[PDB]
Amino acid sequence: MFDPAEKYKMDHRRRGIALIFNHERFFWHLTLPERRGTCADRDNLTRRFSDLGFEVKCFNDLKAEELLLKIHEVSTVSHTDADCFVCVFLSHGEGNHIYAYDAKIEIQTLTGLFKGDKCHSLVGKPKIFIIQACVYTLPAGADFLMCYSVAEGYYSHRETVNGSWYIQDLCEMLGKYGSSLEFTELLTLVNRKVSQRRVDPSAIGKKQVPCFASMLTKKLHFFPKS
Amino acid sequence: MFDPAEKYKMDHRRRGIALIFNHERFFWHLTLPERRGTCADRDNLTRRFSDLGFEVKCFNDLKAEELLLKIHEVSTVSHTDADCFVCVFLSHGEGNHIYAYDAKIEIQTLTGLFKGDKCHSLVGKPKIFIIQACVYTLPAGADFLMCYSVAEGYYSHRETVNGSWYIQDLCEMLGKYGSSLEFTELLTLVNRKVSQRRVDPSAIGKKQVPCFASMLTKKLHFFPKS
């Protein structure tokens, strides 16, 4: 009775919520390519997730009191009619040590809220966290899919006005193959595209190697919703 | 010219070497189910990898001076004719703090030897590390596939005379689908089988959730060699 092609059933009325979180709290000063690239990432992400059928919410940690309200409300919501949940963590490239340390606490809080014990509404439903990296950054959970812009011990290359290499290469793959390929198959393409995107500065010969940790159990497809 | 179905070319004359490493150095005393289960794992693994076409070598850290010889020789070998490399780390369930700390150092050494800079013979060839878990256990590298018996913050359940849940459920999937399915697809089945294998002791209601971190870039297939 064991099925090697079993998929997470994406038949529910709602696809789910796509949370786009921007880490901007303690970045002391921003160049315009830094201000412009994070915006292109939020918009390119909002487009691609909306096309697959996601409800998109964008938050910033600049509004400290609003944040606790915004994070709590989304956690309390029930996802019984949702197929899956998606969270995206956007962080700037070169920040101070407090900015990066705050990033670790926020990722550990966000992933912790949707664990099996804390979110019965998402049990057996995939929880997809896409993290853009800068005392741990590697958590776990059942039916979780953790996607990192850069693996441990690898460098991430500077943000541009067009955006970030990981995001833009993810969005382009989502637009071309969002409904076509399985998500792990799609992310494997992002790994090759970003790694092959090997590119005036003192960082010559360096490649950005993305990574995804999968605790999923069934195949993940995003066939056109209806 | 971008191909969404591109695979690592498995046409080379040799498939590669399958390294089965047994961590037995500082385990102070062993019950017979502990002595018997690790043996069933080594043998069930040797069978399944040999069928796919792997050269199997088994090492133990009990022979301290032999170990440095054995680890070094395999690292120096050239894998130009090999398709891929596979390493398996077998550790006992409940050990002391030194046994587990030695496990971290050995995994960090083994994975470090086959990084892109240290093994030109395996550049662009997949490096597959299957770790049975017990100051870090999460390393990285290009074209690496890290497979863990249990994710972080999850418990692994005791070894039996038949073997370990992760290994036996991996071998059974390898025998049925070793040549059929893609490796990441195959490991996704191991995640479901072990997690569904929810099972008299004080650990009631606990599930073992496996995990795999993928830095691969192309699809991985093990079609019958010839």
Author numbering:
A (entry chain A), B (entry chain A): 30 to 163, 197 to 261, 266 to 292
Study authors write:
Caspases belong to a highly conserved family of cysteine proteases that have essential roles in programmed cell death, inflammation, differentiation, neuronal development and axon pruning. In addition to being activated by initiator and effector caspases, Casp6 can be activated by a unique intramolecular self-cleavage mechanism due to its longer intersubunit linker. Excess neuronal active Casp6 is associated with Alzheimer disease (AD) neuropathology and age-dependent cognitive impairment. By investigating the activity of four rare natural Casp6 variants (Casp6-A34E, Casp6-E35K, Casp6-A109T, and Casp6-T182S) and employing X-ray crystallography along with molecular modelling, we have identified a putative allosteric pocket on mature active Casp6.
Following our previous work, which described rare natural Casp6-R65W and Casp6-G66R variants with significantly impaired activity, we examined four additional missense rare variants with single amino acid substitutions located remotely from Casp6 active site: Casp6-A34E, Casp6-E35K, Casp6-A109T, and Casp6-T182S. A34, E35, A109, and T182 are not conserved in 12 human caspases and in Casp6 from different species. To assess the effect of mutations on Casp6 structure and function, we solved apo mature crystal structures of Casp6-E35K and Casp6-A109T but crystallisation attempts were not successful for the two other Casp6 variants. Casp6 variants were catalytically active against Ac-VEID-AFC but Casp6-A34E, Casp6-E35K, and Casp6-T182S, displayed lower activity than Casp6-WT in enzyme concentration-dependent manner whereas the activity of Casp6-A109T was comparable to Casp6-WT. Casp6-A34E, Casp6-A109T, and Casp6-T182S did not show significant changes in kinetic parameters, KM, and kcat, for Ac-VEID-AFC hydrolysis compared with Casp6-WT, whereas Casp6-E35K displayed slightly reduced kcat and consequently showed ~2-fold reduced catalytic efficiency kcat/KM. In addition, E35K substitution disrupts a salt bridge between E35 from the large subunit and K284 from the small subunit of the same Casp6-WT protomer, possibly further destabilising a functional oligomeric state of Casp6. The Casp6-A109T crystal structure did not reveal any significant changes around the mutation site, supporting our findings that A109T substitution does not have a significant impact on Casp6 activity.
